[PDB]
Each structure stands twice: as C-alpha cells, then as structure tokens.
mmCIF file of C-alpha atoms and ligand atoms in Angstrom:
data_model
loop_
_atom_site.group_PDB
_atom_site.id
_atom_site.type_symbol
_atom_site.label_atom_id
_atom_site.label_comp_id
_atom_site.label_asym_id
_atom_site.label_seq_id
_atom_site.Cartn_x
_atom_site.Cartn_y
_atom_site.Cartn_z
ATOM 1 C CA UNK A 48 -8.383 -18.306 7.055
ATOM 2 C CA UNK A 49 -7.683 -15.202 9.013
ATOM 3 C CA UNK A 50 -5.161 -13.738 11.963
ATOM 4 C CA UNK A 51 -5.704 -10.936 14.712
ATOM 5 C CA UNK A 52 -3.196 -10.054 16.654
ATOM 6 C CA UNK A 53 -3.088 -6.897 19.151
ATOM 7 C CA UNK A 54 0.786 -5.164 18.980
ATOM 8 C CA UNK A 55 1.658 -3.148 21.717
ATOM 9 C CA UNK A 56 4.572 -0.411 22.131
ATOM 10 C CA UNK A 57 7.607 -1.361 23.785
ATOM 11 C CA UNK A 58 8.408 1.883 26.084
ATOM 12 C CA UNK A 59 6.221 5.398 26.109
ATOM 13 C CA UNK A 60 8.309 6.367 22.658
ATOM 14 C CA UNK A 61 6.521 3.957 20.634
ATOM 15 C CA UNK A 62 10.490 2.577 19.980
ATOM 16 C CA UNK A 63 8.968 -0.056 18.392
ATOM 17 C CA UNK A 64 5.879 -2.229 18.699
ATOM 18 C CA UNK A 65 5.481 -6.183 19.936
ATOM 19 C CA UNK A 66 3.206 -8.638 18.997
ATOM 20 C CA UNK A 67 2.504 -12.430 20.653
ATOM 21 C CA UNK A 68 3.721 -14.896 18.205
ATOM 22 C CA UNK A 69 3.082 -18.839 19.359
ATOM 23 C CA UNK A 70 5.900 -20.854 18.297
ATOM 24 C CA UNK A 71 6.101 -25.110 18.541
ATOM 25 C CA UNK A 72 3.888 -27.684 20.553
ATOM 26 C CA UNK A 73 3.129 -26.844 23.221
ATOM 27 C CA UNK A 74 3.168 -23.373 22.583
ATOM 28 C CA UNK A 75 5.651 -21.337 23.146
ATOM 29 C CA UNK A 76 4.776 -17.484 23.379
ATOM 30 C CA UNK A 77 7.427 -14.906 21.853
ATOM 31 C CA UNK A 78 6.708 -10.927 21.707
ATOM 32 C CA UNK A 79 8.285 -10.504 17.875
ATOM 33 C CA UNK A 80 8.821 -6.934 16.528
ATOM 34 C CA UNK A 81 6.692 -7.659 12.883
ATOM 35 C CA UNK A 82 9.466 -5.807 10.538
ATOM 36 C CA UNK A 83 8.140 -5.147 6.815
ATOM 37 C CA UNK A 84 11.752 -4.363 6.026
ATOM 38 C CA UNK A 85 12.928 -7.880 6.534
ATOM 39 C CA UNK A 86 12.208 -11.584 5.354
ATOM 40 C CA UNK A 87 13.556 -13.303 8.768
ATOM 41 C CA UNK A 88 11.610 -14.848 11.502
ATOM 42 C CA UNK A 89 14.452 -15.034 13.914
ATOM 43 C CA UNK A 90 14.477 -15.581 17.708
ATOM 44 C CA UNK A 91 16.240 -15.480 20.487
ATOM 45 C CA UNK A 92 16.855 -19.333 21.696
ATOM 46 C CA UNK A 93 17.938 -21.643 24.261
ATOM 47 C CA UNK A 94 21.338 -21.499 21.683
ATOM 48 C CA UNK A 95 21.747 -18.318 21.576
ATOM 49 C CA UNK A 96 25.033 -16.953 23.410
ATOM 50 C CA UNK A 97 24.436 -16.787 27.059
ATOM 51 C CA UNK A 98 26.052 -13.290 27.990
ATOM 52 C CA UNK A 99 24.441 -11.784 24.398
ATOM 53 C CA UNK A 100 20.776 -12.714 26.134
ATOM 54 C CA UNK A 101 19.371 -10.081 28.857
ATOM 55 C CA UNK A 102 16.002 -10.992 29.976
ATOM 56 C CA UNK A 103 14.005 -12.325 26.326
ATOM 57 C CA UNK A 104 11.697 -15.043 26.291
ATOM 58 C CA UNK A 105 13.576 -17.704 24.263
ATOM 59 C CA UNK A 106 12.824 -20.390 21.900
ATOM 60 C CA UNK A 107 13.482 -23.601 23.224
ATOM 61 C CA UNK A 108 13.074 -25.863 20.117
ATOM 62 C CA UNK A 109 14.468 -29.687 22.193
ATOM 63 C CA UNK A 110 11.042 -28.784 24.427
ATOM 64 C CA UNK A 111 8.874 -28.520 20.812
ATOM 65 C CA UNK A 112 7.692 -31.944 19.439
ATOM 66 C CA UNK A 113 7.047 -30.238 16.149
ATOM 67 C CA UNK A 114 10.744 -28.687 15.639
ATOM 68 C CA UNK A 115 13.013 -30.457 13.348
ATOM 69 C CA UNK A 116 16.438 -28.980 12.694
ATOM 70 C CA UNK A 117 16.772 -27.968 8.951
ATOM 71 C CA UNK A 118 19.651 -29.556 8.026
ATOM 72 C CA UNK A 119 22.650 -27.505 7.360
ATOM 73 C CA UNK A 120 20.990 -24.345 6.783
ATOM 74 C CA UNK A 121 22.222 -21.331 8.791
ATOM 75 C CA UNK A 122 21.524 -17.406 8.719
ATOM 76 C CA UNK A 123 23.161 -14.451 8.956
ATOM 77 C CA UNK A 124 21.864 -10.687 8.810
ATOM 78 C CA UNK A 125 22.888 -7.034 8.961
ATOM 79 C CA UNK A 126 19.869 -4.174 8.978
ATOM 80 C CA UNK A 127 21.284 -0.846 7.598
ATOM 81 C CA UNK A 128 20.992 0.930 11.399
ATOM 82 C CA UNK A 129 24.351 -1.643 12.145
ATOM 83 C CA UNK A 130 22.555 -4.213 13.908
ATOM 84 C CA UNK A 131 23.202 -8.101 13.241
ATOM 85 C CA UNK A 132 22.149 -11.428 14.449
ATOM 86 C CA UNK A 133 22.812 -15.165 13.120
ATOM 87 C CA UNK A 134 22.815 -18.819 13.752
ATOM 88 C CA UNK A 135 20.668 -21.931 12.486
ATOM 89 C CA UNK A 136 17.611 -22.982 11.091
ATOM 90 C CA UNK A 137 14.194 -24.952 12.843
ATOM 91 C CA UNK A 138 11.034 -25.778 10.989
ATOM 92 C CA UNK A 139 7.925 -25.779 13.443
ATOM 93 C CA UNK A 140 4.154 -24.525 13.874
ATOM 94 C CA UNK A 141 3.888 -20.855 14.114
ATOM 95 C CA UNK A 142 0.794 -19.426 14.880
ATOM 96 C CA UNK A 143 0.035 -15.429 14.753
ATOM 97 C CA UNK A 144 -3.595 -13.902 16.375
ATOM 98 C CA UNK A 145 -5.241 -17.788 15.358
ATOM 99 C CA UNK A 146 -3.740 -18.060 12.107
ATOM 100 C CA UNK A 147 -1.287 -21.345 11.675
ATOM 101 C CA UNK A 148 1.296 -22.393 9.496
ATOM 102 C CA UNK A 149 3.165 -25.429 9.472
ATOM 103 C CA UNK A 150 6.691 -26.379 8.678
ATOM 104 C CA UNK A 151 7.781 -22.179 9.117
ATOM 105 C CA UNK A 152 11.285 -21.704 8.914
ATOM 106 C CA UNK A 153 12.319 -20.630 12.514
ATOM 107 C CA UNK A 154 15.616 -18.855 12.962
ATOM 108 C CA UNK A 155 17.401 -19.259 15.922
ATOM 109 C CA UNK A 156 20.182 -16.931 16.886
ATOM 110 C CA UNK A 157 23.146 -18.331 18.186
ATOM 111 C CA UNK A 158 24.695 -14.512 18.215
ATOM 112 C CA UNK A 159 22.817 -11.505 18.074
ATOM 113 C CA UNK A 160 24.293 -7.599 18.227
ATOM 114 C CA UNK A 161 24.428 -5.340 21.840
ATOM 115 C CA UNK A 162 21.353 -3.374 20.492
ATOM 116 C CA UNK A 163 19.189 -6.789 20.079
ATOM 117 C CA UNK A 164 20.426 -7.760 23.745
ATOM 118 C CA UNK A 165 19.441 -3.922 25.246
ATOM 119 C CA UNK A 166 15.851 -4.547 23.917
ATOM 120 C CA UNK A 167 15.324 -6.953 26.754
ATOM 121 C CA UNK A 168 10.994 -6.363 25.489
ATOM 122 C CA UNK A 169 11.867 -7.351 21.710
ATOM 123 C CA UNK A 170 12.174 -11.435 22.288
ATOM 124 C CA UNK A 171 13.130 -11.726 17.676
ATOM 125 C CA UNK A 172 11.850 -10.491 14.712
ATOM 126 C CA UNK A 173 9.109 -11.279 12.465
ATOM 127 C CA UNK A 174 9.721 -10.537 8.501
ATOM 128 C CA UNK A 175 7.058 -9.042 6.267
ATOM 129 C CA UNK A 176 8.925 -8.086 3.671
ATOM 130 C CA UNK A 177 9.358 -9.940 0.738
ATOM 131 C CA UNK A 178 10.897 -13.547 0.035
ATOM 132 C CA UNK A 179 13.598 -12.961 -2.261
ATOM 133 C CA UNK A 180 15.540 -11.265 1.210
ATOM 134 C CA UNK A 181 15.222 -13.951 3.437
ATOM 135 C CA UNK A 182 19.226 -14.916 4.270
ATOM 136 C CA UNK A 183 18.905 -18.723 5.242
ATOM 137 C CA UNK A 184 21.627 -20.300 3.301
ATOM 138 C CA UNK A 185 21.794 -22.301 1.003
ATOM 139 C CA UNK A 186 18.769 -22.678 0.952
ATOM 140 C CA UNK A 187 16.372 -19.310 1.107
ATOM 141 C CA UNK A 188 13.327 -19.555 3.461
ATOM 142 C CA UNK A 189 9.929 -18.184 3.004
ATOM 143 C CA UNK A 190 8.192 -15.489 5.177
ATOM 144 C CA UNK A 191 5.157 -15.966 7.379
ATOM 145 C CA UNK A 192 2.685 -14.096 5.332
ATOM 146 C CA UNK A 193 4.341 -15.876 1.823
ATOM 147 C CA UNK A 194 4.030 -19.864 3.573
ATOM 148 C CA UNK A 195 0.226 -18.360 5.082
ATOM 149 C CA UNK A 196 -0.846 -16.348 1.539
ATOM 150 C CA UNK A 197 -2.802 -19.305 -0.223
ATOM 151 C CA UNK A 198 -4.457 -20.145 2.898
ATOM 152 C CA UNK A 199 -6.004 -16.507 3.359
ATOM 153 C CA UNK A 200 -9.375 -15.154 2.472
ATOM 154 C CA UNK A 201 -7.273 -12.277 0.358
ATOM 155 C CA UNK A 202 -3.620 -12.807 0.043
ATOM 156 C CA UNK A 203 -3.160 -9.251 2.276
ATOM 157 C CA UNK A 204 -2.322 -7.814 5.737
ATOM 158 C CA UNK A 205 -2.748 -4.816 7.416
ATOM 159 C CA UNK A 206 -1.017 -2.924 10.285
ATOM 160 C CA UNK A 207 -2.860 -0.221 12.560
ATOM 161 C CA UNK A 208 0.268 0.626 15.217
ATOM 162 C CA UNK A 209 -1.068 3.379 17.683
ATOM 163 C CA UNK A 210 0.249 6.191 19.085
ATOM 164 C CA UNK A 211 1.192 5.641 22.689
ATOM 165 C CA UNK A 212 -1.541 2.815 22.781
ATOM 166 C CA UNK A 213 -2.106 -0.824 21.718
ATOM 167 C CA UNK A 214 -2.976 -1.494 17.470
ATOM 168 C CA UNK A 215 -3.553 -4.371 15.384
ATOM 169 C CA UNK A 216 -2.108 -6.674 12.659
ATOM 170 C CA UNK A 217 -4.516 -8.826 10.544
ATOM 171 C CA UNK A 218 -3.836 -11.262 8.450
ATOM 172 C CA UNK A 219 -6.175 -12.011 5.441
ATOM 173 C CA UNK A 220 -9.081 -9.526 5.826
ATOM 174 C CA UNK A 221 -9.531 -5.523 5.639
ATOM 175 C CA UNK A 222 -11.054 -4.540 8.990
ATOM 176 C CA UNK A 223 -13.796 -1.570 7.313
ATOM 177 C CA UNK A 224 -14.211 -0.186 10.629
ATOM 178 C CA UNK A 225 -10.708 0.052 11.261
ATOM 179 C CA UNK A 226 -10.415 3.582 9.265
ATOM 180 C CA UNK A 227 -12.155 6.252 7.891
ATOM 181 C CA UNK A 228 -12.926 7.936 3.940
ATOM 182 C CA UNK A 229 -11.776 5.356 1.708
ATOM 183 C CA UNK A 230 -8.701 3.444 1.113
ATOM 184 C CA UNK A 231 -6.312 4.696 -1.426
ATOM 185 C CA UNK A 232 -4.263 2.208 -2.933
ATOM 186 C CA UNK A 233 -0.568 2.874 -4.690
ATOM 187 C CA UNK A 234 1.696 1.220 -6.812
ATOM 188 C CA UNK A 235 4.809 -0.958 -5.030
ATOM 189 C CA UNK A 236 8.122 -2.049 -6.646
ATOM 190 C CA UNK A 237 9.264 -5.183 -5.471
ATOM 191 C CA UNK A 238 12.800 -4.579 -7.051
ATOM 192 C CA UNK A 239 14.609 -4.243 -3.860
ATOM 193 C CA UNK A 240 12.557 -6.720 -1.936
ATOM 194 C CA UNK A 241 10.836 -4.029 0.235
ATOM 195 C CA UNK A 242 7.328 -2.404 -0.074
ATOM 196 C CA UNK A 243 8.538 0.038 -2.328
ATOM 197 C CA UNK A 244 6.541 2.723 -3.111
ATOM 198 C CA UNK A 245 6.504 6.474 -4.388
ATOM 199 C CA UNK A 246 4.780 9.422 -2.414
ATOM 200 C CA UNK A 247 2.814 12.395 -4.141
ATOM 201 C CA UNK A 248 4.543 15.270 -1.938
ATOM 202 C CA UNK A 249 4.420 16.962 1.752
ATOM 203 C CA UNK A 250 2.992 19.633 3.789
ATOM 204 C CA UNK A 251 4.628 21.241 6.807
ATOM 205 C CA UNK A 252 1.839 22.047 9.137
ATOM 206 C CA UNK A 253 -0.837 24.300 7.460
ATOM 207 C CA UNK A 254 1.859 25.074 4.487
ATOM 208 C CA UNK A 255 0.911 24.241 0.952
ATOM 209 C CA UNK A 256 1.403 21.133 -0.498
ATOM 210 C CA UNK A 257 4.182 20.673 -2.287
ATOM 211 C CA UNK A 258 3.730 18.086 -5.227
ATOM 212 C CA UNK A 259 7.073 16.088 -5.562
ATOM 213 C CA UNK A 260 7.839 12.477 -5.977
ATOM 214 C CA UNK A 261 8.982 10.727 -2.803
ATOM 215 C CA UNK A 262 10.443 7.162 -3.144
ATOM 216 C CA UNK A 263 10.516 5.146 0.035
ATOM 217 C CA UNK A 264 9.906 2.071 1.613
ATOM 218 C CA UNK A 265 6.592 0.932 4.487
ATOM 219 C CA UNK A 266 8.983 -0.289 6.983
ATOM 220 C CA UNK A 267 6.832 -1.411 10.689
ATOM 221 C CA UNK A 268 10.019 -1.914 11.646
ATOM 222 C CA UNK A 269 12.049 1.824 11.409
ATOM 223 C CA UNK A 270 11.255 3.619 13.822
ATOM 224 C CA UNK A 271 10.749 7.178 12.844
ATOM 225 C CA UNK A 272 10.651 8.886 9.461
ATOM 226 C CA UNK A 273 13.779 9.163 7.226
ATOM 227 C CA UNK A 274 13.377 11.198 4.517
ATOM 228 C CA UNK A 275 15.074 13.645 1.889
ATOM 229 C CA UNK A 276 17.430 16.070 3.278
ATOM 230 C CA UNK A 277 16.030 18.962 1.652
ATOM 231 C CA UNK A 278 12.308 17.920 3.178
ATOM 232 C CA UNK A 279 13.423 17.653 6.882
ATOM 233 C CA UNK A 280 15.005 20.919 6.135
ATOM 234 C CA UNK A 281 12.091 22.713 5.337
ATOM 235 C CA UNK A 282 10.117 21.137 8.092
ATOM 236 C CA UNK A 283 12.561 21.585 10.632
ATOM 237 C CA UNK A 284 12.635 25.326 9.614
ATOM 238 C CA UNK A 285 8.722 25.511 11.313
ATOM 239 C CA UNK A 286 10.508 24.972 15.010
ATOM 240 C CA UNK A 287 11.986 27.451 16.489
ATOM 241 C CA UNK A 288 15.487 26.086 17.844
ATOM 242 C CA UNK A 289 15.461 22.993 15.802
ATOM 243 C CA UNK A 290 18.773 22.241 14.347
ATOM 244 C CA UNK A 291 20.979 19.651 13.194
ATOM 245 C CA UNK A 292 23.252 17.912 15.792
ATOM 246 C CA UNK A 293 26.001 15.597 14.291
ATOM 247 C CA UNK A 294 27.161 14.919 18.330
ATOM 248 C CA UNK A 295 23.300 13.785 19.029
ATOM 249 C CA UNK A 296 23.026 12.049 15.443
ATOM 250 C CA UNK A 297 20.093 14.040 13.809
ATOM 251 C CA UNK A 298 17.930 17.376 14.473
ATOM 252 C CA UNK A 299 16.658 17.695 18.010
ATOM 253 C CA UNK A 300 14.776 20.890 19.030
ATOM 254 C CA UNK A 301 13.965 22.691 22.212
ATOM 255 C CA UNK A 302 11.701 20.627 24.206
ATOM 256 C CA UNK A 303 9.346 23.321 25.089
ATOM 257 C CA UNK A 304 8.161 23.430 21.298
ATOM 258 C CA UNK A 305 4.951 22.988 19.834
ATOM 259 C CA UNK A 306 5.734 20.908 16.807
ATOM 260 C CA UNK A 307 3.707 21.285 13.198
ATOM 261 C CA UNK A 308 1.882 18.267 11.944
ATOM 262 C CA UNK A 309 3.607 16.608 8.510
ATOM 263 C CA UNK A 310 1.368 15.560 5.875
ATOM 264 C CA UNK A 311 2.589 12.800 3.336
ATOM 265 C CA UNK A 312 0.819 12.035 -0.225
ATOM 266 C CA UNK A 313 -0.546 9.476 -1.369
ATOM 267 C CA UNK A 314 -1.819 9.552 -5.104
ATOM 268 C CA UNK A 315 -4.583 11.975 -4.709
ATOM 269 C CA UNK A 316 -4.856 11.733 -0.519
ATOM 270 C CA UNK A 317 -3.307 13.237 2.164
ATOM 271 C CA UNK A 318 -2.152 11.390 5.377
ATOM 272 C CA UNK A 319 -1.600 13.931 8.167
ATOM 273 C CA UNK A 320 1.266 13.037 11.009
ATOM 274 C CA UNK A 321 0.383 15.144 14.248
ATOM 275 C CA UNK A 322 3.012 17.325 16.023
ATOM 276 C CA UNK A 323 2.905 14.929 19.018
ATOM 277 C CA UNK A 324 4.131 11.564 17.116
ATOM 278 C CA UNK A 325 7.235 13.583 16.084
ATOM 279 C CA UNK A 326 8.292 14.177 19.789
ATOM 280 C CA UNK A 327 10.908 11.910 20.728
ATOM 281 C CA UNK A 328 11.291 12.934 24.049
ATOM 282 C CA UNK A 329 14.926 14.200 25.774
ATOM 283 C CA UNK A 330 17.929 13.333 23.853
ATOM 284 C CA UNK A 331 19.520 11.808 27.690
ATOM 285 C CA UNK A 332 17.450 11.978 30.859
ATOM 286 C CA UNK A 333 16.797 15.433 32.338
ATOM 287 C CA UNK A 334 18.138 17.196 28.868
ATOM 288 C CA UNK A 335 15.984 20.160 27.675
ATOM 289 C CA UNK A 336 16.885 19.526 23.744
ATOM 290 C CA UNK A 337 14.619 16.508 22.480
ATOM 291 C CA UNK A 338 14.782 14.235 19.519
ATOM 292 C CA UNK A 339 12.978 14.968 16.089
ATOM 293 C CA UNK A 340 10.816 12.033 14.882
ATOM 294 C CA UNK A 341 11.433 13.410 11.428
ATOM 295 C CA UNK A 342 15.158 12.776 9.983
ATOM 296 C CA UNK A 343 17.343 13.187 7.143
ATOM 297 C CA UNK A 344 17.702 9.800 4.942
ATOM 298 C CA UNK A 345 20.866 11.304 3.248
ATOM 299 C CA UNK A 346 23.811 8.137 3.872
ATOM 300 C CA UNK A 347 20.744 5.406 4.615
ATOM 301 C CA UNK A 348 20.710 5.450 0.539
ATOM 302 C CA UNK A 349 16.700 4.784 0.781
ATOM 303 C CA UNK A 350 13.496 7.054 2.076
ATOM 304 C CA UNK A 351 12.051 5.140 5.224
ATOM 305 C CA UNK A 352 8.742 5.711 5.831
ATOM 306 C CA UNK A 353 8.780 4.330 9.197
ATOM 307 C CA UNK A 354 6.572 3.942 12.522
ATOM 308 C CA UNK A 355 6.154 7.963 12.725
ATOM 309 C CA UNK A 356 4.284 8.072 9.741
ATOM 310 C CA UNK A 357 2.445 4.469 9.487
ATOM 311 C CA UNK A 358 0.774 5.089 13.040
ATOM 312 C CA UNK A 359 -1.114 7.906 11.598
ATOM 313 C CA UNK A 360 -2.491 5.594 8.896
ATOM 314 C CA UNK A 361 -4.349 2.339 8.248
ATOM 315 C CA UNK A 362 -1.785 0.778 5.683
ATOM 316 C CA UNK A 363 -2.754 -2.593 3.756
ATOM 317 C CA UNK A 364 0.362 -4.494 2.570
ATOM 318 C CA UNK A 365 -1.916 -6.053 -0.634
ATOM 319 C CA UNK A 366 0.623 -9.402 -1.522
ATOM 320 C CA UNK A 367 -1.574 -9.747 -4.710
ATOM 321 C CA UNK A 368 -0.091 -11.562 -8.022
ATOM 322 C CA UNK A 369 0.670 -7.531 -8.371
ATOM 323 C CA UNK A 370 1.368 -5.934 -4.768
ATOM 324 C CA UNK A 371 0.195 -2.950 -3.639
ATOM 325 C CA UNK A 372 0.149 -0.800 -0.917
ATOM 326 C CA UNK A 373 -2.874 1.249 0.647
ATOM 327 C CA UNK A 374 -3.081 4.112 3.045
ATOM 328 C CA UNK A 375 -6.190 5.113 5.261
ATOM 329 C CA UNK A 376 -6.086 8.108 7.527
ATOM 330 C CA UNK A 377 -8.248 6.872 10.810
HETATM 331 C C1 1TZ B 466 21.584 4.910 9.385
HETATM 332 C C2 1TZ B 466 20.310 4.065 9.531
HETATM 333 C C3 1TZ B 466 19.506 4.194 10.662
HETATM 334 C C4 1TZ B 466 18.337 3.438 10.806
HETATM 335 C C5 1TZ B 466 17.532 3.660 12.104
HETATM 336 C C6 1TZ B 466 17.959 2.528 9.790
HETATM 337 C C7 1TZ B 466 16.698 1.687 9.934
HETATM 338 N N1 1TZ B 466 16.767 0.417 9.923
HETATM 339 N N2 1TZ B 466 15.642 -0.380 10.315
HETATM 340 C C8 1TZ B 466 15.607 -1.697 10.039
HETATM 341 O O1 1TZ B 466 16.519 -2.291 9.460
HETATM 342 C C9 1TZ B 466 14.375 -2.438 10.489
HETATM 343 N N3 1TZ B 466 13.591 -2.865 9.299
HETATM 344 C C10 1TZ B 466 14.698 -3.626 11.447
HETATM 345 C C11 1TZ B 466 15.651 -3.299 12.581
HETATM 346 C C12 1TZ B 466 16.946 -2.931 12.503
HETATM 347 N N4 1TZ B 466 17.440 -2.742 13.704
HETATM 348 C C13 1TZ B 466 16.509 -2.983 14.654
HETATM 349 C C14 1TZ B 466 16.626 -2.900 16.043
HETATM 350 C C15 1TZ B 466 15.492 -3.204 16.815
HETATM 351 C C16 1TZ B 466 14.282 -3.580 16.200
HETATM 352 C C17 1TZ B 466 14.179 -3.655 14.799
HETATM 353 C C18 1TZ B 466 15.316 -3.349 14.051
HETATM 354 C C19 1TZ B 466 18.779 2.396 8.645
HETATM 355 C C20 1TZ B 466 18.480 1.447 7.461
HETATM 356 C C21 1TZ B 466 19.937 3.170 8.532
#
C-alpha cells in the first residue's frame, strides 16, 4: 500500500504546514501538523476544555462507530518550545492521502497549552518520530507510520514542504520525479527517539565550505533552523544590521536586507537554503527589524534542523530494520 497527501502552510511564514488526516466512520477530516519530532497523534476533541478550544475542527469520537475508548490509558506531553497538551486515549480508523490503518491510537486532549489554542489552523498533531516517545501511559502507543510500516511497498516516507506553496507527504514510495541529481542517503541514530543525524558542514552564501560535524535532528515540525551558536554567528555576520536581540528572542536584521543563501552538508552533497526562506517577516506589525529564520540552538540542548532547511530538500525518512535519512535538493 501507499499514501499521498498534499500539506499546505498555515499563514504566508510557512509557520508550519497542515495536512488532511480522516479520522473514524464516517470520516471525520482533521488538518494535523505531521511532527517528525514527536510519537503522538493527538487532537483536539469534543473533550477537550471548552475555553482552551478557538475555532479547530474537533474529534468527536461518540459520533465514530469505529472508536472504542482504550481503557485507562491517558497522555501527557511537553515539546521543548514550552508547549503541552494531555488527556485520554481512542482507538479508531485513521486514514492519511488513501492509506488506512486500523485500531490507531487516537489522542484526545482534554487540555492543551495557549499556543495550541492561538493556532486556530493546526486542528492536533501527527507523530513521525519514533515509537519508543510516544507518552500514552501505561501503556505506550505506536505511531502512524510504525502501525502502517508492514503494510507499505517500502517501510519509508517522504516530506516535500514548499516554500510559500502547497508540498507533499507520501507514505510507502519515493516519488523519482519529485527531485533532482540523486538521493544521498545518511546515517540516523535512533538513541534519542528522533531522526538523528550528523551534517558534513555549512556555507554562508558563496563562502567556502566549511567541513565540520553537525549533529541534529529532521524535525517537520520546528519551524526554522536551530543550530550551533558559533554557525549562526558567522552567518549572521553576512547581514548588515543583523544582531542578536534577547528582548525579541533571537537575531533579527534590518528588513531592507538581502539575505545570503545557507548551504548544509550532507555526506558528500550540498543542500542550498535560499536567502528568501530565512525571512521571517517583521518582528510585530509595521516594525522595520525582521526575524532571522536561522537561530542559535545554544539552551534547546539539540541542533534542529527544522522547516527552513527541509523545504529546500526532498528528505526520505527510510524506517528500514536500519533507518536512514536521505536528502535531495529539487
Ligand atoms: C527553546 C526552543 C524553541 C523551539 C521553537 C523548540 C522547537 N520545538 N519544536 C517541537 O517540539 C515540534 N517537534 C512540535 C511542536 C512544539 N510546539 C509546537 C507548536 C505548534 C506546532 C508544533 C509544535 C525547542 C525544542 C526549544
């Protein structure tokens, strides 16, 4: 079997990216942000705390035939930016671009944090990361892609986010026209439970490469790029005006910049991240200082390779006996 499933930015920032996710019987359609930092599939729900819910689609699981309450699990998690949600456990039929599994553990939230009820476009989260971090209790919960992985044609998907436009996450096949040159495929460490992986070096603009080792982790579900302080220093350096702002919470630089591409190794390749996808726009409405896609990881205690720099790639999440990851520029 196989999925296809078009995800599609949130807001003209490409804050994060949505995809249509068809929970129960009859169907009920949810936009879930697909996070490969995370091993929940939670939702918002006809449980979840009436004041904490500003305009979602919810999960209503009494109106599913195929929901039955998992018995005395519940679920509780905190992502390292300070958000949280929690609450109890459904299994039902969850279907993602035409692929189906049965019996997927369904979280519904019965509290979620203020920045979960702000995203009134973000109706839950879909995990891609691996197993061992689900948090249903006691009993731990499989992911989507683990529960669909025997059923694929390869055990593997694939996310192609755009920049300021619509991209794609399949399920079970590499799309060969999705990308050009050739795929190049690096080792992952599964210690931590993330796709784990270790970058070649980094170029600012048309600088020379510089060959260092770069531990991070492919995370659809970060935002922008968090990497070592004394990288974001050196690329920062390229823009006249940039700086560091511990008001603002990062580097922001004069909007009337033309920002330098950032190139990211992989083994032997080189994926390029265009000026543009760096641009975060004014740091408050009207403001002439913008935000830097680019920021320090220093305190986050882990390299993010986040939406800034998957969107400039075709990445392959390989869930092999072995994982690995690949990179495509396209
Ligand atoms: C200081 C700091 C700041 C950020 C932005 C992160 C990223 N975290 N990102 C995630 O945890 C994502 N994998 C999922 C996620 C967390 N908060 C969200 C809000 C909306 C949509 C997705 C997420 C971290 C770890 C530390």
């Amino acid at each position: 079997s196989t999925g296809s499933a078009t995800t599609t930015p949130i807001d003209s920032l490409d804050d994060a990216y949505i995809t249509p996710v068809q929970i129960g019987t009859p169907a009920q359609t949810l936009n879930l942000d697909f996070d490969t930092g995370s091993s929940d599939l939670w939702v918002f729900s006809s449980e979840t705390t009436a004041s904490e819910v500003d305009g979602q689609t919810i999960y209503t699981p009494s109106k599913s035939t195929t929901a039955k309450l998992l018995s005395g699990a519940t679920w509780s998690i905190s992502y390292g930016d300070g958000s949280s949600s929690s609450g109890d456990v459904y299994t039902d039929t969850v279907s993602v671009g035409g692929l189906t599994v049965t019996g997927q553990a369904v979280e519904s939230a019965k509290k979620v944090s203020s920045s979960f009820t702000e995203d009134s476009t973000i109706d839950g989260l879909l995990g891609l990361a691996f197993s061992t971090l689900n948090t249903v209790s006691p009993t731990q919960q499989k992911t989507f892609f683990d529960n669909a992985k025997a059923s694929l044609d390869s055990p593997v998907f694939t996310a192609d986010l755009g920049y300021h436009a619509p991209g794609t996450y399949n399920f079970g096949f590499i799309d060969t026209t999705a990308y050009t040159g050739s795929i190049t495929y690096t080792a992952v460490s599964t210690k931590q439970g993330f796709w784990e992986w270790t970058s070649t070096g980094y170029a600012v603009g048309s600088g020379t490469f510089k060959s260092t080792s770069i531990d991070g982790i492919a995370d659809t579900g970060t935002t922008l790029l968090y990497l070592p302080a004394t990288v974001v220093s050196a690329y920062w350096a390229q823009v006249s005006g940039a700086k560091s702002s511990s008001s603002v919470g990062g580097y922001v630089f004069p909007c009337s910049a033309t920002l330098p591409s950032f190139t990211f190794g992989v083994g032997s390749a080189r994926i390029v991240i265009p000026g543009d996808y760096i641009d975060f726009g004014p740091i408050s409405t009207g403001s002439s200082s913008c935000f830097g896609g680019i920021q320090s990881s220093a305190g986050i205690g882990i390299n993010i390779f986040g939406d800034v720099a998957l969107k400039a790639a075709f990445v392959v999440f390989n869930g092999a006996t072995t994982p690995t990851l690949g990179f495509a520029s396209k």
